Amino acid sequence: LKAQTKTEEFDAIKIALASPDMIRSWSFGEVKKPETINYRTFKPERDGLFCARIFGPVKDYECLCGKYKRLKHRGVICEKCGVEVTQTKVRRER
Amino acid sequence: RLVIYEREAPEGTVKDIKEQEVYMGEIPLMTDNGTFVINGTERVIVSQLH
Amino acid sequence: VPLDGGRFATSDLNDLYRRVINRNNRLKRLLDLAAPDIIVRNEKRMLQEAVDALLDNGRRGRAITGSNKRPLKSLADMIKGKQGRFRQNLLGKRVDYSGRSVITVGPYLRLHQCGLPKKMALELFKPFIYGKLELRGLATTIKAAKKMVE
Amino acid sequence: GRTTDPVRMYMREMGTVELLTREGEIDIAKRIEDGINQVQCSVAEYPEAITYLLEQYDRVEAEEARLSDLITGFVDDPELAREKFAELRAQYVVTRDTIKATAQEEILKLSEVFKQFRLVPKQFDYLVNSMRVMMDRVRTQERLIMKLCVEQCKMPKKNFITLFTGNETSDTWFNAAIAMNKPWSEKLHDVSEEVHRALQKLQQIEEETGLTIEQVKDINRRMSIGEAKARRAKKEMVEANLRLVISIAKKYTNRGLQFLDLIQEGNIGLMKAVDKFEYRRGYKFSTYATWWIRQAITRSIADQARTIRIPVHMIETINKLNRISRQMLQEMGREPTPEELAERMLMPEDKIRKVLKIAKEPISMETPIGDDEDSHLGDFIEDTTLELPLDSATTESLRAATHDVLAGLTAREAKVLRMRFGIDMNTDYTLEEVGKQFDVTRERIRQIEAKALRKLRHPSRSEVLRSFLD
Amino acid sequence: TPEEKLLRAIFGEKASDVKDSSLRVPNGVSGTVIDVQVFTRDGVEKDKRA
Ligand SMILES: [Zn+2]
């Protein structure tokens, strides 16, 4: 049978040195600015330590600017500010 | 009291403005029972030994 | 994340990361501005210091957090934890379905049993109680069951 | 030795440079002048440099771009500009026709009038870059043609450059030197195609830049020399004055940026000061640069050092309150009431709340609370965002409630009610659309719903669901 | 969500724009109210009970 592709049970954790490319793997974007939040509307400043574009939407299944707020549109990256609409839990992951 | 000494001594002042009592902070008071009240609460400062 | 009184709260990693980012950018700019060597060197050194403070603080000058004397907790300290040596899976963890109270005698007991306070048993088995309740049909829906034991 | 802290590293590394003698300041500034203006003259000697300015101004009077983008000032108004530019075009059209031993006099003047223009930094840089890029192309063809002889067809570089220099376009060096009956001569018959196809672009550049390859190299090369001189002198100046930067940065110390940060942004300030300075105005460079450094410092500070960045003017506006807060401090007894400040300011008086709120820096999530333990404040922040389990239970059940109750309605009543809402289906459907998929539209469909609800209103279909609303 | 959309549609319940923040008696403790205090911000209109 084919070995596997994606999530299944696991064993045997390995640890080793990181490579620039291996680092660029887990990274879904580069934070270019020290900014965090807008200071008025507490929404994340794009390309900052807190960012919806790079990391994740503030509220579940709702894009930042709000073009797609519906649970229907999920695997869609927004045109305005690219934020794919998915659980805010992925802001703990990415 | 703020004294401004005229430069080139003997020391004597051009003007010394003696300001009236200037309020710096308020300080806690001790009850007849030997307690202090910080916020609506009786508090005690334990004597230190060193 | 927010807090009462409109105030905020945040990890020290943000202070650190912020420093590293800022200095890095400043270095890029100084490169484009063709700054003299002494400056680009000083900057590179500072960046090394910052990155260090981020990874593990205290092998270096021990940076302090914004408007606070206490040294900012670095990533190494995020891992190591504290209270001797444990990371969250040893020293302890908070656990659901549990309780406690003062203990009493109960000589009438049999060695295989113990007196459990009524309210306690109510609160502990609350999820099971819901289930049985609407299992027999004494409750319309789970909500109603909650209202029943409430 | 090095005490490891970068403060001392920089402190000593800089203290190795001597203070500039009052003569040396003028000497260095002079060197600067020599260099820069040299690169400028190098720009003016480029034909395409002039042509570009013309081609852009054509777009300026064509409303395809503004003047502010193409220039700021001449050496010294839209009409005055509209004429002065026509002067440039004039000197161009005269210098252009003499390109036939006479021209050497007028091409001097074309440069002068071009020098009368103060360009925009973006534009000037665009020109410089363009020049050196052209030279990169020239080099492309030069190295290409070179590697087809010495590296491939095996000819000495000694004999290669012999007839190569001075033409590098025509066949005087190529076709006339292949027949020479030399050892490296008869070897060139194989690559004769490639080189000859390569000469095309080489002769083409001469038509574009309007220069012979010879001249082309010389001009921007001399320019490079000039730029090098400039950066060298400038750097010398900056390195000389670092002590000043440090001295200034010491004032801004606890504002929330480290000593090294302050002296760095300030150092950038000093760099800028060395960029914009004119010694001809007799202004002391010290006191002149002081402003620039203090400027970069303040700007940087208020711009970054906060976790939550606040717009520039805002910080100032806060300070303005922090001012009058003090005068009334002991004078007023306790202090001026939260609503009695901004009367002294000019503004709606409400700003105090918001400004005084968003301002205060967030508390470290690691701030240890009582017990001194690892009980740090962050471990006490509860998650409200995640739904409690007792909820998801009820939702899981409401699925079953709505489904069971939708099992009792008729076929088209179930379909219409599920369709009207988003029940177990992607999005929902407009009441106009619900009939579009039913072939029976308008009021009819909107009726079946209104009746359906009625059926689910009374204590048969309405019972199980009733409890769900508390 | 659609389930609650249908639910609110059928039972005609306008979802309030406000959540209950009221201070409830701690669960399990029972006593008699002796005293009530109201501290109003300076400048905010005093309510009836105040
Ligand atoms: Zn969007």
Bridge partners of D363?
A: C9
Calculate the alpha carbon distances from D121 to D88, D124, D211 in Å.
20, 5, 25
Q: At what angle do helices D259-276 and D6-14 cross, to 10 degrees?
A: 30
3-state secondary structure of E2: helix
Distance from CA of D424 to the nearest CA of E (A): 8
CA quadruple C18, C22, C27, C33: dihedral, nearest 10: 170
CA-nearest residue to C14 within chain D is: D307
- C147 and chain D in contact, CB less than 8 A: yes
Give Cβ neighbours of residue C82 (< 8 Å, ≥ 6 apart). Answer: D374
Instruction: Produce one character per residue of A39-65: b if its CB has 16 or more CB atoms within 10 Å, e if not.
Output: beeeebbbebbbbbbbbbbbebbbbbe
Q: β-pairing, B2-5 with B13-17?
A: antiparallel
Give Cβ neighbours of residue D137 (< 8 Å, ≥ 6 apart). Answer: D201, D205
Tokens 């894009």, residue located = A63
Tokens 């990391």, residue located = A55
Rounded Cα gap, residues D83 and D293, in angstroms: 40
State both tokens at A2. Answer: 């084919």
Upper half-sphere CA count for residue D145 (Cβ side, 13 Å): 24
User: Which residue in D259, D283, D261, D262 sits closest to D273, CA to CA?
Assistant: D283
Distance from CA of A56 to the nearest CA of C (A): 15
Rounded Cα gap, residues C132 and C142, in angstroms: 10
The answer to whether the beta carbons of residues D413 and D419 sit under 8 Å apart is no
Bridge partners of C9?
A: D363
Rounded Cα gap, residues A89 and B10, in angstroms: 78
Q: In 10 A of CB D403, how many CB atoms? A: 14
Rounded Cα gap, residues D54 and D411, in angstroms: 77
3-state secondary structure of B16: strand
CA quadruple D41, D46, D48, D49: dihedral, nearest 10: -10
Could you say which DSSP state residue A89 is in?
Answer: G
User: Which residue in D442, D394, D8, D208 sits closest to C139, CA to CA?
Assistant: D394
State both tokens at A31. Answer: 């934070």
User: Which residue in C149, E10, A56, C59 sits closest to D5, CA to CA?
Assistant: C59
The answer to whether the beta carbons of residues D322 and D359 sit under 8 Å apart is no
3-state secondary structure of E29: coil
The answer to whether the beta carbons of residues A66 and A79 sit under 8 Å apart is no
State both tokens at D308. Answer: 């939550």
In degrees rounded to 5, what are phi and psi of residue D344? -70, -25
- The DSSP code sequence of C46-95 is HHHHHHHHHH-TTSSS--B-TT-SSBPP-HHHHHH-SSSS--SSSS----
Distance from CA of D130 to the nearest CA of E (A): 60
Contacts of D231 in chain C (CB under 8 A): 34
Angle at B14 between CA B8 and CA B18, to 5 degrees: 135
Rounded Cα gap, residues D168 and D191, in angstroms: 16
H/E element, C20: helix C12-32
- The DSSP code sequence of E30-50 is ----------PPTTSPP-S--
The answer to whether the beta carbons of residues D421 and D403 sit under 8 Å apart is no
Rounded Cα gap, residues C110 and D34, in angstroms: 105
Rounded Cα gap, residues D289 and D237, in angstroms: 11
CATH topology of domain D310-387: Arc Repressor Mutant, subunit A (1.10.10)
Is B25 exposed, middle or buried, given 0-12, 13-18 or 19+ CB atoms closer than 10 A? exposed
In degrees rounded to 5, what are phi and psi of residue D216? -50, -50
Give Cβ neighbours of residue D316 (< 8 Å, ≥ 6 apart). Answer: none
The answer to whether the beta carbons of residues E22 and D465 sit under 8 Å apart is no
Calculate the alpha carbon distances from E2 to A52, A69, D221, D431, D469 in Å.
27, 15, 73, 15, 15
CA quadruple D173, D176, D181, D183: dihedral, nearest 10: 20
The answer to whether the beta carbons of residues D277 and D33 sit under 8 Å apart is no
- A87 and chain D in contact, CB less than 8 A: no
Calculate the alpha carbon distances from C4 to A58, D362, D381 in Å.
19, 12, 11
User: Which residue in C106, C125, C102 sits closest to C115, CA to CA?
Assistant: C106
Contacts of C137 in chain D (CB under 8 A): none
Calculate the alpha carbon distances from D393 to C134, D388, D389, D398 in Å.
13, 9, 6, 9
User: Which residue in C61, C81, C66, C62 sits closest to C12, CA to CA?
Assistant: C66
Overall residue count recorded for chain A in this entry: 94
State both tokens at D465. Answer: 């669901």
The answer to whether the beta carbons of residues D292 and D237 sit under 8 Å apart is no
In degrees rounded to 5, what are phi and psi of residue D119? -85, 175
The answer to whether the beta carbons of residues B28 and B36 sit under 8 Å apart is yes
- E7 and chain D in contact, CB less than 8 A: yes
Rounded Cα gap, residues B25 and E29, in angstroms: 42
State both tokens at D29. Answer: 């500034």
H/E element, B37: strand B36-37
Note the Cα D465 to chain centre separation in Å: 59
The answer to whether the beta carbons of residues D340 and C43 sit under 8 Å apart is no
The answer to whether the beta carbons of residues D44 and D115 sit under 8 Å apart is yes
Instruction: Produce one character per residue of A5-31: b if its CB has 16 or more CB atoms within 10 Å, e if not.
Output: eeeeeeeeeeeeeeeeeeeeeeeeeeb
Q: At what angle do helices D213-249 and D121-147 cross, to 10 degrees?
A: 130
Calculate the alpha carbon distances from B29 to B32, B35, B41, D345 in Å.
10, 8, 13, 37
User: Which residue in A70, C23, E47 sits closest to D265, CA to CA?
Assistant: C23
For the structural domain made of D388-470, what CATH number should be given? 1.10.10.10
User: Which residue in D389, C133, C97, D469 sits closest to C149, CA to CA?
Assistant: C133
Bridge partners of D120?
A: none
Q: In 10 A of CB B30, how many CB atoms? A: 11
Give Cβ neighbours of residue D162 (< 8 Å, ≥ 6 apart). Answer: none
End-to-end CA distance of chain E: 42
As a three-state string, the secondary structure of chain D is CCCCCHHHHHHHHHCCCCCCCHHHHHHHHHHHHHHHHHHHHHHHCCHHHHHHHHHHHHHHCCCCCCHHHHEEEECCCHHHHHHHHHHHHHHHHHHHHCCCCCHHHHHHHHHHHHHCEEECHHHHHHHHHHHHHHHHHHHHHHHHHHHCCCCCCCCCHHHHHHHHCCCCCCCCCCHHHHCCCCCCCHHHHCCHHHHHHHHHHHHHHHHHHHCCHHHHHHHHHHHHHHHHHHHHHHHHHHHHHHHHHHHHHHHHCCCCCCHHHHHHHHHHHHHHHHHHCCHHHCCCHHHHHHHHHHHHHHHHHHHHCCCCCCCHHHHHHHHHHHHHHHHCCCCCCCCCCCCCCCCCCCCCCCHHHHHHHHHCCCEECCCCCCCCCCCCHHHHCCCCCCCCHHHHHHHHHHHHHHHHHHHHCCHHHHHHHHHHCCCCCCCCCCCCCCCCCCCCCCHHHHHHHHHHHHHCCCCCCCHHHHCCCC
* Inter-chain CB proximity D417 and E6 less than 8 Å: yes
Calculate the alpha carbon distances from D61 to C8, C85, D67 in Å.
54, 76, 9
For this PDB entry, the determination method is X-ray
Could you say which DSSP state residue A34 is in?
Answer: S
Could you say which DSSP state residue C119 is in?
Answer: H
D interface with B, Cβ–Cβ below 8 Å: 330, 333
Rounded Cα gap, residues C15 and B49, in angstroms: 41
**Topology alike, domains D1-309 and D388-470:** no
State both tokens at D90. Answer: 């004039």
State both tokens at A67. Answer: 């073009």
Tokens 């025509």, residue located = D170
The answer to whether the beta carbons of residues D35 and D29 sit under 8 Å apart is no
Rounded Cα gap, residues A46 and A49, in angstroms: 9
Contacts of C43 in chain D (CB under 8 A): 264
The answer to whether the beta carbons of residues E6 and D402 sit under 8 Å apart is yes
List of long-range contacts for E23-31, beta carbons under 8 Å, 24+ apart: E28/C119
Rounded Cα gap, residues D465 and D397, in angstroms: 10
What one-letter code names the amino acid at D166?
G
Q: In 10 A of CB D455, how many CB atoms? A: 16
Rounded Cα gap, residues D470 and E15, in angstroms: 12
Which of D258, D306, D369 is the best substitution to test chain C (most C C-beta atoms within 10 A)? D258
State both tokens at D337. Answer: 């009431």
Rounded Cα gap, residues D131 and D124, in angstroms: 11
User: Which residue in D386, D393, D87, D45 sits closest to D210, CA to CA?
Assistant: D45
The answer to whether the beta carbons of residues D457 and D428 sit under 8 Å apart is no
H/E element, E4: helix E2-11
Could you say which DSSP state residue E16 is in?
Answer: P
Q: β-pairing, D117-119 with D71-74?
A: antiparallel
Contacts of B24 in chain D (CB under 8 A): 330
CA-nearest residue to A30 within chain C is: C21
Distance from CA of E3 to the nearest CA of D (A): 6
* Inter-chain CB proximity C70 and D360 less than 8 Å: no
Q: Which one of A36, A39, A70 has the shortest CB-CB distance to D427?
A: A70
- E13 and chain D in contact, CB less than 8 A: yes
Taking the centre of ligand 1 as the mean of its atom positions, its distance from the CA of residue A64, in whole angstroms, is 5
Distance from CA of D253 to the nearest CA of A (A): 20
Question: What does the domain layout of chain D look like in residue ranges?
Answer: 1-309, 310-387, 388-470
Taking the centre of ligand 1 as the mean of its atom positions, its distance from the CA of residue A32, in whole angstroms, is 20
Residue D156 preceded by cis peptide, ω within 30: no
CA-nearest residue to B24 within chain D is: D330
The answer to whether the beta carbons of residues C75 and C13 sit under 8 Å apart is yes
What one-letter code names the amino acid at C20?
V
Angle at C58 between CA C53 and CA C63, to 5 degrees: 55
CATH topology of domain D1-309: RNA Polymerase Primary Sigma Factor (1.10.601)
The answer to whether the beta carbons of residues D31 and C66 sit under 8 Å apart is no
Calculate the alpha carbon distances from D41 to B49, D29, D98, D103, D113 in Å.
83, 18, 20, 17, 11
Tokens 């002391």, residue located = D284
In sign, the C-alpha dihedral spanning D117, D122, D123, D129 is: positive
Rounded Cα gap, residues C84 and D403, in angstroms: 55
CA quadruple D57, D58, D60, D65: dihedral, nearest 10: -100
Chains that touch A (3 or more CB pairs under 8 A): C, D
* Inter-chain CB proximity A34 and D308 less than 8 Å: no
